[PDB]
Design a protein around this motif. Sequence first.
Motif, mmCIF file in Angstrom:
data_model
loop_
_atom_site.group_PDB
_atom_site.id
_atom_site.type_symbol
_atom_site.label_atom_id
_atom_site.label_comp_id
_atom_site.label_asym_id
_atom_site.label_seq_id
_atom_site.Cartn_x
_atom_site.Cartn_y
_atom_site.Cartn_z
ATOM 1 N N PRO A 27 8.275 45.421 -29.141
ATOM 2 C CA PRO A 27 7.514 46.576 -28.651
ATOM 3 C C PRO A 27 6.151 46.716 -29.299
ATOM 4 C CG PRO A 27 9.303 47.282 -30.062
ATOM 5 C CD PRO A 27 9.516 45.829 -29.820
ATOM 6 N N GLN A 28 6.066 46.659 -30.627
ATOM 7 C CA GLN A 28 4.799 46.764 -31.334
ATOM 8 C C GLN A 28 4.816 45.783 -32.491
ATOM 9 O OE1 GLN A 28 6.830 49.457 -31.362
ATOM 10 N NE2 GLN A 28 6.068 50.554 -29.569
ATOM 11 N N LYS A 29 3.635 45.315 -32.882
ATOM 12 C CA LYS A 29 3.533 44.405 -34.011
ATOM 13 C C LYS A 29 2.408 44.848 -34.929
ATOM 14 C CE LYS A 29 5.369 41.141 -34.835
ATOM 15 N NZ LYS A 29 6.498 40.989 -35.788
ATOM 16 N N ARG A 30 2.646 44.709 -36.225
ATOM 17 C CA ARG A 30 1.679 45.076 -37.245
ATOM 18 C C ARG A 30 0.548 44.055 -37.259
ATOM 19 N NH1 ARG A 30 0.843 41.848 -41.129
ATOM 20 N NH2 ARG A 30 3.073 41.724 -41.660
ATOM 21 N N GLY A 31 -0.657 44.517 -37.598
ATOM 22 C CA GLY A 31 -1.816 43.652 -37.598
ATOM 23 C C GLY A 31 -2.791 44.038 -38.693
ATOM 24 N N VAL A 32 -3.735 43.136 -38.939
ATOM 25 C CA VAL A 32 -4.763 43.318 -39.957
ATOM 26 C C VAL A 32 -6.117 43.157 -39.284
ATOM 27 C CG1 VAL A 32 -5.714 42.474 -42.127
ATOM 28 C CG2 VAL A 32 -3.259 42.525 -41.804
ATOM 29 N N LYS A 50 -15.533 49.461 -27.598
ATOM 30 C CA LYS A 50 -15.152 49.322 -28.998
ATOM 31 C C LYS A 50 -13.864 48.514 -29.081
ATOM 32 C CE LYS A 50 -18.086 52.984 -29.411
ATOM 33 N NZ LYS A 50 -18.822 53.608 -28.277
ATOM 34 N N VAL A 51 -13.850 47.493 -29.930
ATOM 35 C CA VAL A 51 -12.771 46.517 -29.914
ATOM 36 C C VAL A 51 -12.720 45.851 -31.283
ATOM 37 C CG1 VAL A 51 -14.153 44.591 -29.025
ATOM 38 C CG2 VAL A 51 -11.717 44.748 -28.413
ATOM 39 N N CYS A 52 -11.543 45.361 -31.660
ATOM 40 C CA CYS A 52 -11.351 44.781 -32.981
ATOM 41 C C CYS A 52 -10.624 43.447 -32.896
ATOM 42 C CB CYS A 52 -10.606 45.748 -33.901
ATOM 43 S SG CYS A 52 -8.978 46.237 -33.340
ATOM 44 N N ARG A 53 -11.131 42.476 -33.647
ATOM 45 C CA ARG A 53 -10.475 41.187 -33.813
ATOM 46 C C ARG A 53 -9.399 41.313 -34.880
ATOM 47 N NH1 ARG A 53 -9.629 37.437 -30.666
ATOM 48 N NH2 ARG A 53 -11.825 37.411 -30.020
ATOM 49 N N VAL A 54 -8.171 40.918 -34.552
ATOM 50 C CA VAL A 54 -7.008 41.301 -35.344
ATOM 51 C C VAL A 54 -6.257 40.063 -35.795
ATOM 52 C CG1 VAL A 54 -4.896 42.659 -35.452
ATOM 53 C CG2 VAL A 54 -6.780 43.390 -33.954
ATOM 54 N N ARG A 55 -6.013 39.966 -37.097
ATOM 55 C CA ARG A 55 -5.011 39.058 -37.633
ATOM 56 C C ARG A 55 -3.657 39.751 -37.607
ATOM 57 N NH1 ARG A 55 -5.050 34.547 -40.554
ATOM 58 N NH2 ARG A 55 -6.718 34.089 -39.047
ATOM 59 N N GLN A 74 -11.846 50.306 -40.154
ATOM 60 C CA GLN A 74 -12.537 49.387 -41.034
ATOM 61 C C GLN A 74 -11.967 47.998 -40.816
ATOM 62 O OE1 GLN A 74 -15.104 50.411 -42.915
ATOM 63 N NE2 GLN A 74 -14.740 52.424 -41.992
ATOM 64 N N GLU A 75 -12.666 47.002 -41.336
ATOM 65 C CA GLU A 75 -12.025 45.718 -41.525
ATOM 66 C C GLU A 75 -11.117 45.785 -42.740
ATOM 67 O OE1 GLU A 75 -15.098 46.098 -40.530
ATOM 68 O OE2 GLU A 75 -15.340 44.776 -38.799
ATOM 69 N N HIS A 76 -10.171 44.844 -42.784
ATOM 70 C CA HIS A 76 -9.020 44.878 -43.688
ATOM 71 C C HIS A 76 -8.292 46.212 -43.575
ATOM 72 C CE1 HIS A 76 -10.361 41.095 -45.409
ATOM 73 N NE2 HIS A 76 -11.558 41.635 -45.549
ATOM 74 N N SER A 77 -7.799 46.506 -42.377
ATOM 75 C CA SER A 77 -7.066 47.730 -42.110
ATOM 76 C C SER A 77 -5.812 47.403 -41.316
ATOM 77 C CB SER A 77 -7.925 48.738 -41.355
ATOM 78 O OG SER A 77 -7.187 49.913 -41.085
ATOM 79 N N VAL A 78 -4.764 48.184 -41.544
ATOM 80 C CA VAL A 78 -3.440 47.924 -40.995
ATOM 81 C C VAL A 78 -3.282 48.755 -39.734
ATOM 82 C CG1 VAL A 78 -0.975 48.093 -41.373
ATOM 83 C CG2 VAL A 78 -2.486 47.385 -43.232
ATOM 84 N N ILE A 79 -3.110 48.081 -38.607
ATOM 85 C CA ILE A 79 -3.052 48.746 -37.315
ATOM 86 C C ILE A 79 -1.796 48.308 -36.588
ATOM 87 C CG2 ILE A 79 -5.519 49.081 -37.071
ATOM 88 C CD1 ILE A 79 -5.570 46.582 -35.373
#
Lengths: 87, 129
Positions: A27-32, A50-55, A74-79
């Motif tokens: 359902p959902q996955k954690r990302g950086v 507005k958009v973010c590149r996610v690890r 921010q970058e280096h943020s847990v989403i």
Amino acid sequence: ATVNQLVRKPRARKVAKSNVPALEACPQKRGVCTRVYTTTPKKPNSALRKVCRVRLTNGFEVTSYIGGEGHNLQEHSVILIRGGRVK
Amino acid sequence: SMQDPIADMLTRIRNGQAANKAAVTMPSSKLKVAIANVLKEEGFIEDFKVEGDTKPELELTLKYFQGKAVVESIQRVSRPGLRIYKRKDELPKVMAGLGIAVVSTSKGVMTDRAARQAGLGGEIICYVA
RNA sequence: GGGAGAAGGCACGCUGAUAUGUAGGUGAGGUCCCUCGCGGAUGGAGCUGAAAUCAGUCGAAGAUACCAGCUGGCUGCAACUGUUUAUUAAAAACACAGCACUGUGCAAACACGAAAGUGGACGUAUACGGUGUGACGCCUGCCCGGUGCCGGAAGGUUAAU
RNA sequence: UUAGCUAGUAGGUGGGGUAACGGCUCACCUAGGCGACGAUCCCUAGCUGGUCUGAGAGGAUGACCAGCCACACUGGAACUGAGACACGGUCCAGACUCCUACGGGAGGCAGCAGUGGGGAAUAUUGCACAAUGGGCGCAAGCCUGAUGCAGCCAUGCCGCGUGUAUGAAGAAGGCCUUCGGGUUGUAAAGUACUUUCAGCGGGGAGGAAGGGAGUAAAGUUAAUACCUUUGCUCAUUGACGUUACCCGCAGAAGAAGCACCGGCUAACUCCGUGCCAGCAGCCGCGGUAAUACGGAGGGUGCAAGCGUUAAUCGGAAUUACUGGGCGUAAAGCGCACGCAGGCGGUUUGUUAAGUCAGAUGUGAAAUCCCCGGGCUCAACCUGGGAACUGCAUCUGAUACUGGCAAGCUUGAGUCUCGUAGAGGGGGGUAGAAUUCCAGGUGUAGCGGUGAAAUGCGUAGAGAUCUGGAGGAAUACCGGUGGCGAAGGCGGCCCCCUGGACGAAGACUGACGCUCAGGUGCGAAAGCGUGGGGAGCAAACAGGAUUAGAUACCCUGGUAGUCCACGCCGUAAACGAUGUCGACUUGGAGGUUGUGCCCUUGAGGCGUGGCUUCCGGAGCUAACGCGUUAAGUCGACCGCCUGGGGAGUACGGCCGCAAGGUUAAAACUCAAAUGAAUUGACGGGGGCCCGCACAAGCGGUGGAGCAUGUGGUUUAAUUCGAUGCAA
RNA sequence: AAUACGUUCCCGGGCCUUGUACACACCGCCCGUCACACCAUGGGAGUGGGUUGCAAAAGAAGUAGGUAGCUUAACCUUCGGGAGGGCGCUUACCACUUUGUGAUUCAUGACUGGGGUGAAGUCGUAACAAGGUAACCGUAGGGGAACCUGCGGUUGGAUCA
RNA sequence: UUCUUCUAA
């Protein structure tokens, strides 16, 4: 469509794939957060989306749309991502 | 070439209705008469006239009603490439039973509603409606 | 076709058994035929003799000495076997099968010869001479202005005469 | 795009081994075994009852419950025992952790809790053996993190509330407005009533029945010991527990929220916002008036939940067994051959295999269905039933399909006479043309184009006649003709050779169809050696041409075109229609047979083969097809599954190569597409008109000035019009 | 005043007709290099993993077989021994582990191949009408780019005293 | 004979 051909070869029902493979049936996955930026969309619409590149958790490097209006990312943020393409 | 005389027969019946012919003839078979002696009895033809010594020839009489035809449909269920054997419970009801289904069981050739009253299934030949 | 003995690994002595010599090889005396022979079959004594298995048994080690390949990976160049600077250079040099051009109708072209004559060749264009290139694979573009060569004979030039 | 696999392998004999049979093991023989009905290899996976969806067919799926299987730090091995290769046994090797006086030892939660970790995310180091069982014991009992409870999460399914009547002044206020009003809205306020639940207070079943002791009698025995059996009393046994249920208590009290309103789909206004901010399942909204953004009002949908994402089927007939298509929308191999394969005329018996019927066995329970019952209902629990669509066995049945025999001749195939033909190879042979060579005649141009030019010419071309040479193709016939499966085949003659059709017959006895894999043929260009080379002609060269011209045009010109032998194996190889049957209105032909009628001339009546156009029914999305079906049905094969990517990549295959062949994926889009309609347009076709052109005459553009516009300038040069139509 | 033969062409309009990928409608649609940007991917000297075959090495524990040796409460017994057992010995099998060589798969890789995508670039204008050299299939050659050209085929092409 | 092109609502 002759049944002898149907005997020698079964009907291959087509196998469909996910359009959202990075969640890997979750359902959902954690990302950086890796890079937070804006992007001009394609021809019929003109904005700065507005958009973010996610690890991700599984090492995948994806892009995911920031919904709403205004954010505190921010970058280096847990989403956390849910899916859905942006057309 | 000749893969069935039965599918030959039903199509010659089928094309003769639209051609508005009164007499459809063909070479006869033992199984052909066993079907043709049902549809007269079931009231879908008027006369069949099996004649021929060196080679028997079945000559039919098409039943027409109010100008137009009687045979509204004529099919084939057990084709030579795919046979059909249904039990007494899986006997169909052609046009909700208003038409008839020709089944051959071990007790010769009859209709399905007789075969239900015979209580024994077999090989379903064709649908006549 | 090869590469490829690729690479890499295992066995190896001796003694006994199998079988006190086995597989095999050789082959008598016999026996019969025999046109009888510097015969043919049969017949197997005799000798000769591998290889293998099994079981022992010795050493640190049994192809024990002598004898007798270091292998692998990439790339240059030449396809290769060849040939060469006798006496400081063995190759990428040469040669090569192959390819291309050119010449040549036989009293050939050409070469050696003042000549005669000979080689060419006792061959005749699927032949021979010369040059360049050097297997095989894929190929081989443009320029005749120049230099040569070939073809032309109108005109200019022009020898002895 | 996994095709070969196997040496104890496969079988035998003998010995050994195990509870048991058997390469179970060994020895010795034999060379077998397996595979295209997928062996082998790779990837993924515990399996089934079932679960979820679907009308069904099916599809997906295996948490919970079951049945089985497998595993227990990892790798190993035995042991013991009826039963083990043993979660909570041993032994070894490893890993990791821990203790050590450093000599050594110890350790296994995938038991129940819990801790860390990982993760989007999944609970208490919870209590209690009372019941249900299980182990031991004669019993009493002992143990059980099996078991029964509590906590924990709207995790799910249900049941219940958060009051009920009344109440118009249509209150205030909000919103909106045509400023009239409207709406919020009986809604609230107010009034009367109710106290469910929760809370509080009090009361109070079942799950506790069994069993246990003391007793009595009977049985047993010498027994009235004991013991056993059956009655009787004493006590009980509860973890949950403050249970289920029952009364008091008090007040409307303590108890409603999410999502949505552009269409799809139920429900709109206002205001902010101006292609920004944004929205977004799809189509698509925002570029100053947004029902689609944001806010407000109002409304719709649900409800203790409401949304989003994930995940599966359905819708989707969108793989079409049920239930699809291939003339042009994706799709019939380029054809032919043919094995396995699938499929089969007719008639008689036989067989009873398939098939059908009956009967037995089994298809565990649960679940689902049906009828009941129980909890205040419901969820749930549960009784009975049906069902579990099967499989096995037995008894039939004989129509069909097989199996077995016999027949028949229509299918199929020979024999007999003929028929037409660019049907095939092989070898000749003609005649025109073109080129070239040589010569006579003769003179100044020839050639080419839209114009030219390159070019060819006085060194005598061109032209003209004569002679000769060479290669290639075979005018007219000739034909919407002929033949061949196609690819295709064109002078004449000869040699060899094929196929078709018709006619009377004679015979054969189903001898048939289709055909994956396989085999052959297979245009042109291309390839390989040889040959040949008139014409023609890629490339190439020059000339034009143009803005440019690596093109179209010209002048040249090579491979190539021709032949011999091989390779390639593709073509819009098209009738964009696979092959072999059968039925079904016609008309007009062409070609090729063959009867009859007097051929009464090139005639009429027939009967065949092949082919062309039209066209009825019918079919078709239409277009069309239309007895040679794209009609009606038969058999078998090939193929299709949105577009791009792409018949491409990567492997294999084949080839001298060129490539052929097999054949994807990622990514991306919401289109691509077929017919047909209406316009528009054509450097498309007809017909007509206009000072449109032509026929005329005068002008403008040169000059100077007037006037207007642009531009420039200005403090300002007000504004607007700005092809034709300022 | 001049002049009008005339409708070939030009400009425009109408009508029938045909073609057609056009439809804010030929001032239409449309293509491909190239420049830029984005997206995934092929190849690639290599590089680092995973898995596995193959050939051998390996031999703990365990068990089985043999067993010189040491040993040995029930049983036989002359009391000496008998068998057996123990222990060790060795053998068989085999785990751990090692060697080489392959195979397969993932990751990575200077560089390189195309692909797709652009609300504005550059170059030309091939296709859609007879698209202004009809179009297209094969195959071959050429060429910045669409393309061009040769041979053969197809019509899914217009034209017609 | 020759003759090309028209950006983005």
